[PDB]
Amino acid sequence: HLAKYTIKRIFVPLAEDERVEYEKREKVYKQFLRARGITLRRAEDFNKIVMASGYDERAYEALRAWEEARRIAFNSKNKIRKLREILERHRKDKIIIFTRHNELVYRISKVFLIPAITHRTSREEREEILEGFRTGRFRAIVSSQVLDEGIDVPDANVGVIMSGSGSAREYIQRLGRILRPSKGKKEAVLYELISRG
Numbered sequence: 001h002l003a004k005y006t007i008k009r010i011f012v013p014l015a016e017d018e019r020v021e022y023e024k025r026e027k028v029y030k031q032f033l034r035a036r037g038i039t040l041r042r043a044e045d046f047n048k049i050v051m052a053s054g055y056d057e058r059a060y061e062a063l064r065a066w067e068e069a070r071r072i073a074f075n076s077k078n079k080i081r082k083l084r085e086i087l088e089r090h091r092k093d094k095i096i097i098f099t100r101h102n103e104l105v106y107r108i109s110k111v112f113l114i115p116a117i118t119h120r121t122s123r124e125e126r127e128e129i130l131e132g133f134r135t136g137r138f139r140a141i142v143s144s145q146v147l148d149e150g151i152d153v154p155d156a157n158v159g160v161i162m163s164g165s166g167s168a169r170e171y172i173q174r175l176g177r178i179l180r181p182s183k184g185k186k187e188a189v190l191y192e193l194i195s196r197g
Contacts, residue, residue: 002181005188009167012078013197022072025065032062073164073195074101080111082193086160087112087140090189093157093182094133095140096147098175104162108142117143130154148178155180161192168192 014022030040036059038046047066050059073079087095099105102118109116115129115138133141134154147153159175161168172192179188 001186002188003186005176005179005181005190007172007176007190007192009192009194010082011194011196012076012082014073014195015077018072018076022069025069025072028065029062029069032059032065070164071101071103074099074104074162075107076195079104079162079193079195080107083108083160083162084112086158086191090158091139093139094154095158095160096153096156096175096178097140097142097160097162098147098171099142099144099162100168100171101162101164102144105142105144108162112140114138114140114142117141117145117147119145126151146174148174153178157182157188159188159190161190163192163194165195167194 013019029043033040033043033046036046043066047063050056050063053059083097097108097114099108105116105118108114115132117126117129121129129141130151130153132138133156145151156179159179161171161175172190176188176190179190181188
């Protein structure tokens with residue numbers, strides 16, 4: 001019986017060289033949106049359509065733009081610098097990092113020696129990792145795939161959600177259901193890094 005679950009949404013701005021690049025992409029995108037008379041409050045709802053309407057260089061290069069932006073934000077030098085702190089502040093707990101961005105997963109697992117689980121890895125490899133997790137070896141893991149569906153996942157204490165440019169409402173709840181109150185204290189904390197600034 002948990003007794004102190006607590007969420008924290010951290011807003012990490014972008015790097016110098018980063019804002020510049022990000023902005024130039026989003027420029028091309030927003031132009032496409034207005035050029036097609038679409039409000040941005042409905043992007044991606046729109047991209048969903050752009051996708052089902054076949055190919056159009058025009059429209060697609062815009063989606064390719066939306067890509068880089070999303071990308072940049074996710075891998076912000078700061079996102080890492082920040083993650084670092086979290087990993088340190090919570091070196092005494094079991095952490096579960098999540099990100100819908102495959103690349104980041106690797107960037108992380110390689111920058112901080114954290115075992116990873118993506119839509120590759122394996123089936124036993126995966127498991128293997130989870131057993132190591134629940135028995136020491138390593139106190140954290142980064143994973144691109146969902147961890148509740150089927151997967152058992154050890155009792156984790158802190159969860160981190162490396163978002164790109166927006167808040168992952170769903171994911172937050174999903175993860176928070178998976179976490180487990182600590183031994184003593186029986187608390188839990190969930191972070192969600194979001195580029196912004």
